[PDB]
């Protein structure tokens, strides 16, 4: 019953949209940069709700105005049931880091393999979408369509590639 929250997908027939990243961050990330998370100009935001949790568990002011984000219904952004859901749900050796790191990493890989399933690539028009995890941890051990950067280095890649497209229009 817990779909992936992406418009136009048959597989789970919805707020996302497969034509831009799918931005998947950690619970550091939102605490740490919960000013850029409100901002316009980052949408496609897949919010893990062990990730709302951990954010919950760690910063009640920040939780509240994560909240707020989702019950605003104005941001491109979807709250996805990891926890719920029977191919992503993982059970806690291990640290509350590390399986909140592997929570995050199921999910994204998850997310990954179904939006390449649900918008296969269409020869020499486009690719499959790309799932980014937004954090500071080496998520994937230091899937083609899966990634893992800061929020920094996803945001100086995004400048490096408009760059690029503003060079070759000119
Ligand atoms: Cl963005
Ligand atoms: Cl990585
Ligand atoms: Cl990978
Ligand atoms: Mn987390
Ligand atoms: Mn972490
Ligand atoms: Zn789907
Ligand atoms: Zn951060």
Known sequence: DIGCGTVGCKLCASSLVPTAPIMIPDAVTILHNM?????????????????????????????????RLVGGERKQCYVFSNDRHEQTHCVMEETRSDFNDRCVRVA??????????????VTGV??????????????????????????RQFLAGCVTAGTDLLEMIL
């Open 126 to 151: 486009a690719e499959i979408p790309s799932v980014v995890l937004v954090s500071h941890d080496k998520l994937l051990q230091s899937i083609s369509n899966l990634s893992c950067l800061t929020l």
């Open 35 to 67: 000013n850029a998370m409100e901002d316009a100009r980052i949408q496609n935001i897949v919010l893990l709700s062990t990730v709302m949790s951990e954010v919950q568990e760690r910063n009640k002011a920040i939780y509240a105005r994560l909240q």
């Open 108 to 121: 994204g890989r998850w997310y990954a393999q179904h939006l390449a399933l649900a918008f296969p690539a």
